[PDB]
Amino acid sequence: DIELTQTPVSLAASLGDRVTISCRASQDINNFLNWYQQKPDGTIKLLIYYTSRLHAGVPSRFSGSGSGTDYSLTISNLEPEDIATYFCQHHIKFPWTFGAGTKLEIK
Amino acid sequence: VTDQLEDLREHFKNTEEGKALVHHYEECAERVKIQQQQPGYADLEHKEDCVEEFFHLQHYLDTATAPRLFDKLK
Amino acid sequence: MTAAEHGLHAPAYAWSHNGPFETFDHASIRRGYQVYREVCAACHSLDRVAWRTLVGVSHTNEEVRNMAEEFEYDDEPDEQGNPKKRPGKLSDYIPGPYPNEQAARAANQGALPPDLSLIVKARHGGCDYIFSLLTGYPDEPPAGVALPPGSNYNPYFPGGSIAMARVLFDDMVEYEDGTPATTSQMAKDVTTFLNWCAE
Amino acid sequence: WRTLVGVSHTNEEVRNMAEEFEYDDEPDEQGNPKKRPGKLSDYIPGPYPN
Amino acid sequence: EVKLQESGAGLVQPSQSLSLTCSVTGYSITSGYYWNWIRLFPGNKLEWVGYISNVGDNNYNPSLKDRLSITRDTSKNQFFLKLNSVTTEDTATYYCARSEYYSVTGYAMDYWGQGTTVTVSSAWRHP
Amino acid sequence: SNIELAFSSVEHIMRDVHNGYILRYLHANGASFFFMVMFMHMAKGLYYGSYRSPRVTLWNVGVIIFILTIATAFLGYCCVYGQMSHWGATVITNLFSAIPFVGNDIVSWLWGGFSVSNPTIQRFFALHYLVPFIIAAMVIMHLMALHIHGSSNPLGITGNLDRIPMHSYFIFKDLVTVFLFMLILALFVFYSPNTLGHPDNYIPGNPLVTPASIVPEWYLLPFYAILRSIPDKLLGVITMFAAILVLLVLPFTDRSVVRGNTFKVLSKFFFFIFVFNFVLLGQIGACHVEVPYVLMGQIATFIYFAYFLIIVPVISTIENVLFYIGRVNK
Amino acid sequence: KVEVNLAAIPLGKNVVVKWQGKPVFIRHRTPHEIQEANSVDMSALKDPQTDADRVKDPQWLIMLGICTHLGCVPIGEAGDFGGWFCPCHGSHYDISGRIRKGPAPLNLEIPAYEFDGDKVIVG
Numbered sequence A: 001d002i003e004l005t006q007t008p009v010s011l012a013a014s015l016g017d018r019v020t021i022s023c024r025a026s027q028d029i030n031n032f033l034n035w036y037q038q039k040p041d042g043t044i045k046l047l048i049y050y051t052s053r054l055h056a057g058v059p060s061r062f063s064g065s066g067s068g069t070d071y072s073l074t075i076s077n078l079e080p081e082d083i084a085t086y087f088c089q090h091h092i093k094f095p096w097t098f099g100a101g102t103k104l105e106i107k
Numbered sequence B: 001v002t003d004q005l006e007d008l009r010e011h012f013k014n015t016e017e018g019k020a021l022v023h024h025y026e027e028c029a030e031r032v033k034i035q036q037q038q039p040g041y042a043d044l045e046h047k048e049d050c051v052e053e054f055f056h057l058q059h060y061l062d063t064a065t066a067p068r069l070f071d072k073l074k
Numbered sequence C: 001m002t003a004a005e006h007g008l009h010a011p012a013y014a015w016s017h018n019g020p021f022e023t024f025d026h027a028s029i030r031r032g033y034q035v036y037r038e039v040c041a042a043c044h045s046l047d048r049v050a051w052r053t054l055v056g057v058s059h060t061n062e063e064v065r066n067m068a069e070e071f072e073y074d075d076e077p078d079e080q081g082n083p084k085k086r087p088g089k090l091s092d093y094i095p096g097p098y099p100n101e102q103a104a105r106a107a108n109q110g111a112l113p114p115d116l117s118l119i120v121k122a123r124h125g126g127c128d129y130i131f132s133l134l135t136g137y138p139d140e141p142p143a144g145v146a147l148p149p150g151s152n153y154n155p156y157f158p159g160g161s162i163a164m165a166r167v168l169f170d171d172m173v174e175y176e177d178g179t180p181a182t183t184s185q186m187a188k189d190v191t192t193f194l195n196w197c198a199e
Numbered sequence D: 001w002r003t004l005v006g007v008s009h010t011n012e013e014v015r016n017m018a019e020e021f022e023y024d025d026e027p028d029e030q031g032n033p034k035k036r037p038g039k040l041s042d043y044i045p046g047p048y049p050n
Numbered sequence E: 001e002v003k004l005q006e007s008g009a010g011l012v013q014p015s016q017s018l019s020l021t022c023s024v025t026g027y028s029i030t031s032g033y034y035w036n037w038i039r040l041f042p043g044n045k046l047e048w049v050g051y052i053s054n055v056g057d058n059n060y061n062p063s064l065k066d067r068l069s070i071t072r073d074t075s076k077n078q079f080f081l082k083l084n085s086v087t088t089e090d091t092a093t094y095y096c097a098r099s100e101y102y103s104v105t106g107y108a109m110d111y112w113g114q115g116t117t118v119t120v121s122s123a124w125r126h127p
Numbered sequence F: 001s002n003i004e005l006a007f008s009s010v011e012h013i014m015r016d017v018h019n020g021y022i023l024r025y026l027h028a029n030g031a032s033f034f035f036m037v038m039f040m041h042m043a044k045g046l047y048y049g050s051y052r053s054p055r056v057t058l059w060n061v062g063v064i065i066f067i068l069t070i071a072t073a074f075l076g077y078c079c080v081y082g083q084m085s086h087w088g089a090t091v092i093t094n095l096f097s098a099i100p101f102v103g104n105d106i107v108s109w110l111w112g113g114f115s116v117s118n119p120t121i122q123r124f125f126a127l128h129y130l131v132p133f134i135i136a137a138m139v140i141m142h143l144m145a146l147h148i149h150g151s152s153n154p155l156g157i158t159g160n161l162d163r164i165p166m167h168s169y170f171i172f173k174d175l176v177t178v179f180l181f182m183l184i185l186a187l188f189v190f191y192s193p194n195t196l197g198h199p200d201n202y203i204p205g206n207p208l209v210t211p212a213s214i215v216p217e218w219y220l221l222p223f224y225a226i227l228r229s230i231p232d233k234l235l236g237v238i239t240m241f242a243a244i245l246v247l248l249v250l251p252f253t254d255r256s257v258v259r260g261n262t263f264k265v266l267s268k269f270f271f272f273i274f275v276f277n278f279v280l281l282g283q284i285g286a287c288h289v290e291v292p293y294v295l296m297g298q299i300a301t302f303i304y305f306a307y308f309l310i311i312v313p314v315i316s317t318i319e320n321v322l323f324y325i326g327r328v329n330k
Numbered sequence G: 001k002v003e004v005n006l007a008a009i010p011l012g013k014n015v016v017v018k019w020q021g022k023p024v025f026i027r028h029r030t031p032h033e034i035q036e037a038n039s040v041d042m043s044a045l046k047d048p049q050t051d052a053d054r055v056k057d058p059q060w061l062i063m064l065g066i067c068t069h070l071g072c073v074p075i076g077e078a079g080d081f082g083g084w085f086c087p088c089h090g091s092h093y094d095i096s097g098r099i100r101k102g103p104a105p106l107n108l109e110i111p112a113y114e115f116d117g118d119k120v121i122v123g
Ligand code: HEM
Pocket: C035, C036, C039, C040, C041, C042, C043, C044, C108, C111, C112, C113, C114, C119, C123, C130, C134, C162, C163, C164, C167, C190
């Protein structure tokens, strides 16, 4: 059951600058890795599918990338409030598997 | 030589109905600016514009800038 | 249909030839050719019009022989089997600016400038609509109309977004006879000349 | 070329012959010529240019 | 638009059956893509539960395979959880989501339910 | 008739051939006047109830002629090879797909390849040559039917009591309409040569890009309308063709006891609703599939077929009964 | 068979090309646009079909611009469905190239195609 290294184990950041979570698969996943987003009120959304591609509405300042077994999630600026815990799942086979997460608060 | 047409469009913008109608557009052009500074405007989806105005103006111009214009010409 | 998709109705200017008894203004045609030659020839073919056809209308026999030979048409191979050029004859058709459809678009952000020979019939309104699209490039794309990169605004074109930038800017043509080389006089002529071309 | 196929030769046999010659081909995006090998859709070229 | 609406008993007594329901609107259960269950654990970690497809084939998680039963009602445009024999080990928030499928970009859950929180407990509630 | 030279060669006929422009503007404007005059001829036949026994075959054959004239003029249009031409020719070829199963193939055949291409304009030229002789062939049977019963009258009673010989009255009478005909035709041909054509057709046909103003020929419009009025492909086709065929029931549905709207107030009235509907239907053809136009289109179409199928046999049956009780004692 | 330069296609630009005498449509689909396509009711549809079957990568819409009514070439970025309008007898197509309003009985046909580098072989 392919496991994914979420890291840093939730590290906050400053209001006006970027950040960059990352995932690391226990196997080769072939870019089949989406990025999700959990605002504190509970709601979970789509942000990124197939390693690098935006979902409808997620502002262009979101990025994300990777290949083989290592993948990113580069934001541009944390304003106005990207305050949420960003999970990551592989879907190269079954069962699929999210990460630990990476909660993002203010410094 | 002041362009035979430009000149004729000018003179007619500055009659009664020219004033009345250049304004009607300005009121709209202003309204547009106001709507544009706002946040999430690019996703407003039904953004107003003033082509409908513009065209009502040229019609008034055209209707006068046409049977007149051609005699100023060679 | 929104009045923006339609384009604004060009008005009934009063042309020299309008009416059942009205020959063209050949003096006017003569001007349009210059306005044609110096300005729009840069982009626009006029392929179904032949040099000879000008003679007796806008010019005189040599006047058109002169123009004719300023260009090298293809000509039958020498005794060896190798190409050659040659000047033109009155028997010829006024050559296009481009060597094919592609270079026409390459030179225009991928736009295909319409051959003009038939333009005054291949459009509704025609003489008027030709005049108006040429003297109707207003200064700015109306409040709210957001214009693409390399496209202009015209109320007389449908949906304003015309791939042809404005081209009449007073006096850019030196009117040989000595007339106000304006833009509404540079234009009224190429229209009367382009009218001829299609009819 | 195609007309040979099934009569004197076989499909590739004629595809081979075909491409040994560069017919004219539609201009690039710029408006400048180009060659290309032949297709079976072609007519066996003359020795002379005219 | 498309919308997912969770509804069900989120207070289940152990050794029983957790049983949620995900009603949809703005797309159909029987057009295309995938219809999933996913549970969010106390320790804020996410786990894929299983799915019913657009033609109702069941890819379960094998950690929970012996214990569930995804199904659907097609007249009502909704799909169902039935986790048998519940332990506190199962206590977590539950989420329904639609997962698309493309040849190129593979799967992605793009329409998520609002959440329905279950707590395995032997406490008593007024039915 | 080669797809290259085609569009140009007509320009050739225009720019080069001596009196060639007169050749074209006459061919084209004339085709229109053909169609006007033919509608007025078909009108006259409705109004005075010519379609009515013993003249059924007479009538029926004209329905065949009318069909062949549309077929003819269409092909002659496809031969200019402007824009309206290449897309006209696509749709008519495509009406055949509406045919179950085989329909696509028919179209492929009929095209001689992947698209309305070159083997197409070339057959459309050849068939344009053929067919007018078929009309003439047919005009002869049409005149034969006409002959064995002779013409009717704007009174719908028997002629056999006061006949006069076509020479020299009508020969001379017919000469008046003739010159008048040529006059208006002269008017268009020399002064308004395209006040009847679509400017999209001075544009060389292009198989990748349909225009965005698809107005078809005027004499065709009322059918374009009827076609569009139907949100189903197969049914829409059928209903377009049916718009012409239905013309064959007219001698059965006319229930009357007299030939002619002349002494027929209730008949006159709807007869001009019919005419005027038909013109509106035509206006609908010119406008975009916008609102309320679509729904207006739909209603006219109904009115159209209802006039043959419903109004007429109804009204005429009523009108029989007004004629009885409107005099007699008991 | 023909081949397109996918890179030369801006995000949201409609590209037409000559294949088999027909035109072939290629829009570079924005993600908002990708969502519209796949968030729709297949009962509100005449020829009902999942966008994800009609396309391989959802960013690329690839289809023959022949109006399945009587075969015209639909105008791009047109209609009442963010797709295409067919000026011949008003068939409206959406942002996945399928039939919404009009006489067309079918969704704009999807050709055979393979991706390769940023070259797609539309044959
Ligand atoms: C007397 C001068 C000129 C006239 C009358 C003229 C006229 C026209 C006309 C009638 C169109 C057709 C658009 C339509 O009606 O649908 C057109 C388009 C165009 N023209 Fe010109 N033109 C002139 C000069 C030029 C020049 C100097 C250039 C560039 C150097 C140019 C480049 C183009 C291009 C690229 C288009 C394509 C626009 C489109 O596809 O919408 N033209 N022009």
